[PDB]
Design a protein around this ligand. Structure first.
Ligand SMILES: O=c1c(O)c(-c2ccc(O)c(O)c2)oc2cc(O)cc(O)c12
Ligand SMILES: O=c1c(O)c(-c2ccc(O)c(O)c2)oc2cc(O)cc(O)c12
Lengths: 206, 205
């Protein structure tokens, strides 16, 4: 039963990471993920309708580790939301450098996953996630404005974009040129540089 | 002319269409040649492989901006920061206004995988970004050797932070266009980033 279904789902997802990583999403089909996993073909199709659905499963496995700190950062009851957002970003960067799984998935998302008309769902998916992530940072930022943590007149919306843009470019930079930027030693300076932009930038106000 | 000089240009325009439609990984020279109306032999004449075409698209982005870029990185110039702000203004303008620039960037960012089959693509991108970094740092060095940026700021970590902000903003606009108002609020976006290189203590040491 159940136990055995939910072990081969883990086996499928794990061969998917390895296969998308070696060969990229474009030219890896479910047929090939099946063989690496050792499962059958019908195993995969019961589990995952198609490739876009599997890509979304990997992208979802990234949320688990950061869950708690993000919903706390976002609740208007919490009294130190910018410190919750700070500590999230520290955990996001640490996990990236320490957890090879997390780094591998991010490198698939960033450097091995094309947007083509062939599978529009991958693009669509991604637009949702960045919108989701946008919705959260905004609420959290608004919370920091009320709590007088960041300038009281701040554009929460444009600040959320600046910040997402900075964190995303930084992750991508290090995925590309790791031995350049020591993300694990200065990790505090990287998170803080971005956060400074939100409290000091006049361009982000009004 | 002779035979065509601008067969090269016609192959490049077909490469952008092929790559934009179906992405770099599953585009062959045969697709590109069929699309260009020439033979594969005519392609190998200008290019040894696909990675070279990808390189040519990349290199074509530096043409419009190279003047404000060269002006920013020299000592002679009076206004180094104002040249980075102008360059970045032109970068964001060309992107929103030119479809070709927008398509080349959407190819680079969202339509080109880094794989073992073609490791020259990841390599060419590393060098391109390292090249860009040497530049940003030189531009940031003379600005601090002036009234423009705080004294003894780590030129290099601010170079990374800025390249990262801009690169992430561009990619974000390509993903969700009608969410950044990239054109019109242009001034604010460029400045949000440049405010970062002064105002931020974390960028100091
Ligand atoms: O939660 C966040 C998050 O996940 C990311 C992010 C960006 C790219 C990735 O590849 C990734 O794994 C994470 O940026 C953020 C930036 C913020 O200011 C606040 C956040 O809460 C997140
Ligand atoms: O010249 C620059 C440039 O080109 C880009 C850039 C980044 C990502 C792209 O995808 C792109 O097309 C351009 O960022 C910059 C950031 C700076 O601080 C200074 C610059 O001079 C540039």
């Amino acid at each position: 039963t159940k136990e055995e279904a939910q072990e081969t789902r883990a086996q499928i997802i794990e061969a998917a990471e390895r296969a998308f990583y070696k060969r990229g999403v474009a030219r890896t089909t479910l047929a090939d993920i099946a063989e690496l996993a050792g499962v059958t073909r019908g195993a995969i199709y019961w589990h995952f309708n198609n490739k876009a659905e599997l890509v979304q499963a990997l992208l979802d496995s990234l949320h688990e580790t950061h869950d708690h700190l993000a919903r706390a950062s976002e609740s208007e009851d919490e009294v130190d939301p910018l410190g919750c957002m700070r500590k999230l970003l520290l955990q996001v960067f640490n996990e990236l450098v320490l957890d090879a799984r997390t780094r591998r998935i991010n490198e698939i998302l960033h450097h091995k996953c094309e947007f083509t008309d062939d599978m529009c769902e991958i693009r669509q998916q991604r637009q949702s996630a960045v919108l989701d992530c946008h919705k959260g940072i905004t609420l959290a930022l608004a919370n920091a404005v009320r709590r007088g943590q960041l300038p009281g007149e701040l554009d929460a919306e444009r600040a959320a974009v600046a910040m997402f843009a900075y964190v995303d470019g930084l992750i991508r930079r290090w995925l590309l040129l790791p031995d350049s930027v020591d993300l694990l030693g200065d990790v505090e300076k990287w998170v803080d540089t971005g956060l400074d932009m939100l409290r000091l930038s006049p361009a982000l106000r009004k």
